[PDB]
Design a protein around this ligand. Sequence first.
Ligand SMILES: [Cl-]
Ligand SMILES: [Cl-]
Ligand SMILES: [Cl-]
Ligand SMILES: [Cl-]
Ligand SMILES: [Cl-]
Ligand SMILES: [Cl-]
Ligand SMILES: [Pt+2]
Ligand SMILES: [Pt+2]
Length: 106
Amino acid sequence: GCPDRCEPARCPPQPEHCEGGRARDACGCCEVCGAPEGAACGLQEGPCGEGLQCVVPFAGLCVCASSEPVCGSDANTYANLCQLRAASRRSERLHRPPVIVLQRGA
Ligand SMILES: [Cl-]
Ligand SMILES: [Cl-]
Ligand SMILES: [Cl-]
Ligand SMILES: [Cl-]
Ligand SMILES: [Cl-]
Ligand SMILES: [Cl-]
Ligand SMILES: [Pt+2]
Ligand SMILES: [Pt+2]
């Protein structure tokens, strides 16, 4: 049940960082925290964060829209870019800098 036009002055204030990254609400109006990879999404559970797609049997689960390994600014290779970005947010949460992408798996 969405109004035909987003009402921005009604949008809730947000935390500096979100566990599963950023997203929009179901009306595509306000910025909200999105569900992380492997977390429940849809209806009550809310949207997946950036780079994640809500998948359902043909409630859902968030999966990374990309599936290829990536090498970050640390030594650690990440199973996908969603996991690299989460690690980066956790690092920023505890006041460090981000984990940036170097190449792809190597
Ligand atoms: Cl974020
Ligand atoms: Cl799928
Ligand atoms: Cl598919
Ligand atoms: Cl797909
Ligand atoms: Cl990020
Ligand atoms: Cl961030
Ligand atoms: Pt972020
Ligand atoms: Pt798919």
